[PDB]
Design a binder for this molecule. Structure first.
Ligand code: FES
Ligand SMILES: [K+]
Ligand SMILES: [Mg+2]
Ligand SMILES: [Mg+2]
Ligand SMILES: [Mg+2]
Ligand SMILES: [Mg+2]
Ligand SMILES: [Mg+2]
Ligand SMILES: [Mg+2]
Ligand SMILES: [Mg+2]
Ligand SMILES: [Mg+2]
Ligand SMILES: [Mg+2]
Lengths: 86, 96, 23, 99, 108, 92, 70, 137, 46
RNA sequence: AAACUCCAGUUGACACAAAAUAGACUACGAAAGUGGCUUUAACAUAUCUGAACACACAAUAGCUAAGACCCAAACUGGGAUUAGAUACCCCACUAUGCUUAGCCCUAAACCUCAACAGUUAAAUCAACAAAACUGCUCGCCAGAACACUACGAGCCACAGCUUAAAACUCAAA
């Protein structure tokens, strides 16, 4: 309200590609967490539910990264069998 | 026997990794530095997974940013356009 | 855990609060 | 853990096996194997390392002994009578090149 | 202790700015302060529009006053900075140099 | 709560269908789920809840190309759980 | 081992030798190993100043004709 | 010259011109995309209202207002009423995440106006007013 | 050492006598605290 | 459908409310709790244990006085649905959530792990939870239900809180 306008969350259109500018703006707002914040602020989330959700997402991310690391580490052995037959 | 191994700290121990701001002072008046860790479009403070800073310097940067914002040194809703052409130190790409 | 015991505690307490209200 | 007494040390996070102990252990094992072969006992080599299955089978055939480098089915030793016959003779010595 | 006063003053001409700075430093000294040095950071556009003393400001002069004052002075100075009409925004902080630069061995 | 261990181990129906259809369309309007899904521009025809509320079937319009249809199916099947999580997190 | 310290400093100053290691040879001599042997000989035939030993060992190896790029 | 997504700064002079006018002189189309209705208002750089159109002013009623077609029609009507006042280039400022967020701009483009920049100004409190309770449907 | 450093530093402090001149000089000066950091950890001074 | 149309959009001024992002951090505090900025005070003890009652504290809810009131909202109305709706959905609005001075003293107040010190050796070990134990101290427990009850006592509490039985009954729980 007290800030200068047309600086925040603003994307310029290149060669009349308005759809591309909109999709870039959507990507920016989603990456900065603004979209999920707006969607979550429509109704009040109770503090206990918020803490449970944050813990769940944190542990989900940790577990997913660890499983991805394990799969990538064990993917090296997936080559042609060098001792076929024996 | 002279060839037996001797007790010793690892001489090949590599120096422990450092963050880009380690050993440097973070001041709330240095808006140019604090602007390198905020989103150009929203002014939101980047997390450590993007900035790559350590916990101590991440906290220092956060506190300095809040102090500068509330004391009338830094904008809140966007990054100052004067610092848009500064070196990029954050691991984030909008394909923009 | 005993959910019957907690449900028994709930029924006993609720019945008690009805009695004090009545009398 | 049980391999610790046989480890000379760790060289840049790589364990080194004390070869002085290995010499005595190998001496005892080879003496036992030679004595068992002298008594005409059945000797069975076992190893699931497919890189050396051919070599171990060739060696077993060469020395007139037996080899099992393939998938080990349930009960080959503890149920040998049902799997080979009521009068089968089991090995008198088993040598694991890979345990 | 040692304090730094960050002062955002109204965008005025040189005489009024000098008078305001003199008045601020004089108040500091009256409250028992020993002023070490005065820095000028420049006249610049504010990060946002600031409403003070029934006036809207988009531009302002930034100044730093380093000083040594007793602990009881700071509160009083704040109240004084609240009454000065030529001050858009005054904030007293503990001097950053007094804060110790603890050394780090790196990411554990 | 040791998430490590857990991870390792009718008029009402029509209203709920409409609400879920709107919510799923809004979710697909953005990269909130994933950028790969957003680039596909998936469109939904309807949402049907089973009579016993054991499953939610979202009918998505297919395109003419078959490779694109297969890619869309793969991405949607890989994204379904994340959309469920988002729907409950937003308190829809 | 003691020489490991020297090796570390060598591997930190002159870096890894452009010459490749031949681990099949039981008596392979790397540039770092020759530096170590010269360092120990100098220590046994002189004083104990770690920096001076390093610099004089470098001078001696360059005199022999072994390239050493810092 | 490399294209810059970042809008020109009024202070810093730039060469970007649209029909001879600078960035800060272009009219602004304010779109409010609510959950059940969409509003479009075109204003000048000095905040002089030139055109206004919503889904309700174009005849749509009740749930028909909260659709893409209604927002497109409102955008077309606003574009027509703005072209009748000399508007060609516009800067779009969208507010809200309603169904008419993109359809209103589609209508504006289809009505003859050229979009030079898109801005989002959806109200995001830094945790101010407490929102209503979740529905128990 | 600290006391001597403080004693020599006090010579440049602002007093009631030099307030006019020091205010004027500060008004005719500009201090800059801005500096950027690079990915290599180097300071880029403006 | 009701409701509003002193309505709605842009712009400008404008809180005794709440404190995006940072936080993918795991810190402070005895616990309860604590996540906008500045400043002043300030986080006990160089043996350990030591209380339903002593001395201090204790989320949310609740009771007295005054004040503030954006938003939310038990309750209360209106609209809709339904066989009915004294609920769920929509609108409006209270007590209350806020400040000040007093009370009330309860929570799945839980890491469902009492405080200090020590060990990783034994068959590790009913099971599950959260690897198994040792020394020392305080508190507590001896079938289920009756019973977070009755009576007595204490309490700023008066449909309240703490402590807390017995009779009858059963072979289980
Ligand atoms: S790594 Fe040392 S201060 Fe961050
Ligand atoms: K718990
Ligand atoms: Mg004690
Ligand atoms: Mg007692
Ligand atoms: Mg209380
Ligand atoms: Mg209260
Ligand atoms: Mg708790
Ligand atoms: Mg105790
Ligand atoms: Mg006790
Ligand atoms: Mg009993
Ligand atoms: Mg009682």
């Amino acid at each position: 309200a007290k800030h200068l306008k047309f600086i925040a969350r603003t994307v310029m259109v290149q060669e009349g590609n308005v759809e591309s500018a909109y999709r870039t703006l959507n990507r920016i707002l989603t990456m900065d967490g603004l979209i999920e914040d707006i969607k979550h602020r429509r109704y009040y989330e109770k503090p206990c539910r918020r803490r449970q959700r944050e813990s769940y997402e944190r542990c989900r991310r940790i577990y997913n990264m660890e499983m991805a690391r394990k799969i990538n580490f064990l993917m090296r052995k997936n080559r042609a069998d060098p001792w076929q037959g024996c | 026997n002279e060839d037996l191994p001797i007790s010793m700290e690892n001489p090949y121990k590599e120096p422990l990794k450092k963050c880009i701001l380690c050993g440097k002072h973070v001041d709330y008046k240095n808006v140019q530095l604090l602007s390198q860790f905020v989103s150009p479009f929203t002014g939101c403070i980047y997390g450590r997974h993007i900035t790559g800073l350590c916990g101590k310097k991440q906290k220092e940067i956060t506190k300095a940013i809040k102090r500068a914002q509330i004391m009338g040194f830094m904008p809140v809703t966007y990054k100052d356009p004067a610092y848009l052409k500064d070196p990029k130190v954050c691991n984030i790409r909008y394909r923009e | 855990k005993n959910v019957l015991k907690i449900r028994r505690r709930k029924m006993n307490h609720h019945k008690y609060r009805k009695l004090v209200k009545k009398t | 853990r049980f391999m610790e007494p046989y480890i000379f040390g760790s060289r840049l996070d790589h364990d080194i096996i004390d070869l002085e102990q290995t010499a005595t252990h190998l001496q005892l094992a080879l003496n036992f194997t030679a004595h068992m072969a002298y008594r005409k006992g059945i000797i069975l080599f076992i190893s699931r390392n497919r890189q050396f299955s051919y070599l171990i089978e060739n060696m077993a055939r060469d020395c007139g002994e037996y080899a099992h480098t393939r998938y080990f089915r349930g009960g080959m030793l503890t149920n040998a009578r049902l799997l080979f016959g009521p009068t089968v003779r089991l090995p008198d010595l088993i040598i694991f090149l890979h345990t | 202790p040692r304090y730094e006063l960050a002062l955002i003053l109204k965008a005025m001409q040189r005489p009024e700015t000098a008078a305001t700075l003199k008045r601020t430093i004089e108040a500091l000294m009256d409250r028992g302060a020993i002023v070490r040095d005065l820095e000028n950071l420049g006249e610049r556009a504010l990060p946002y529009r600031i409403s003070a003393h029934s006036q809207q400001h988009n531009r302002g002069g930034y100044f730093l006053v380093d000083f040594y004052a007793p602990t009881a002075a700071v509160e009083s100075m704040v109240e004084h900075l609240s009454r000065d009409i030529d001050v858009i925004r005054g904030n007293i902080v503990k001097h950053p140099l007094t804060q110790e630069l603890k050394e780090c061995e790196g990411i554990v | 709560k040791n998430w490590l261990k857990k991870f390792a181990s009718h008029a009402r129906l029509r209203a709920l269908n409409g609400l879920l259809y709107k919510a799923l369309t809004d979710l697909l309007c953005t990269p909130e789920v994933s950028q790969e899904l957003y680039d596909l521009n998936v469109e939904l025809s309807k949402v049907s809840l089973t009579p016993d509320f054991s499953a939610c079937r979202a009918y998505w319009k297919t395109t003419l190309s078959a490779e694109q249809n297969a890619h869309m199916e793969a991405v949607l099947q890989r994204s379904a759980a994340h959309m469920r999580h988002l729907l409950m997190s937003q308190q829809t | 081992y003691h020489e490991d310290r020297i090796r570390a400093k060598f591997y930190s100053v002159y870096g890894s030798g452009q010459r490749a290691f031949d681990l099949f040879n039981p008596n392979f001599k790397s540039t770092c190993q020759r530096f170590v042997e010269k360092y120990t000989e100098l220590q046994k035939l002189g004083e104990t100043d770690e920096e001076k030993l390093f610099v004089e060992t470098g001078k001696a190896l360059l005199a022999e004709g072994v390239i050493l790029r810092r | 010259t490399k294209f810059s997504i970042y809008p020109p700064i009024p202070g810093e002079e730039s060469s970007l011109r649209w029909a001879g006018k600078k960035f800060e002189e272009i009219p602004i189309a304010h779109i409010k995309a609510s959950h059940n209705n969409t509003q479009i208002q075109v204003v000048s750089a000095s905040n002089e209202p030139l055109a206004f159109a919503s889904c309700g002013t174009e005849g749509f009623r009740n749930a028909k207002k909260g659709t893409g077609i209604a927002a497109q029609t409102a955008g077309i009507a606003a574009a027509a009423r703005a072209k009748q006042k000399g508007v060609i280039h516009i800067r779009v400022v969208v507010k809200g995440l309603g169904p008419g967020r993109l359809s209103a701009m589609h209508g504006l483009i289809m009505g003859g106006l050229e979009v030079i920049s898109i801005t989002d100004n959806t109200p995001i409190p830094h945790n101010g007013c407490r929102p209503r309770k979740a529905r128990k449907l | 050492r600290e006391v001597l450093q403080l004693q020599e530093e006090v010579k440049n402090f602002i007093t009631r006598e030099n307030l006019e001149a020091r205010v004027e000089a500060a008004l005719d000066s500009r201090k800059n605290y801005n500096w950027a950091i690079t990915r290599e950890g180097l300071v880029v001074r403006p």
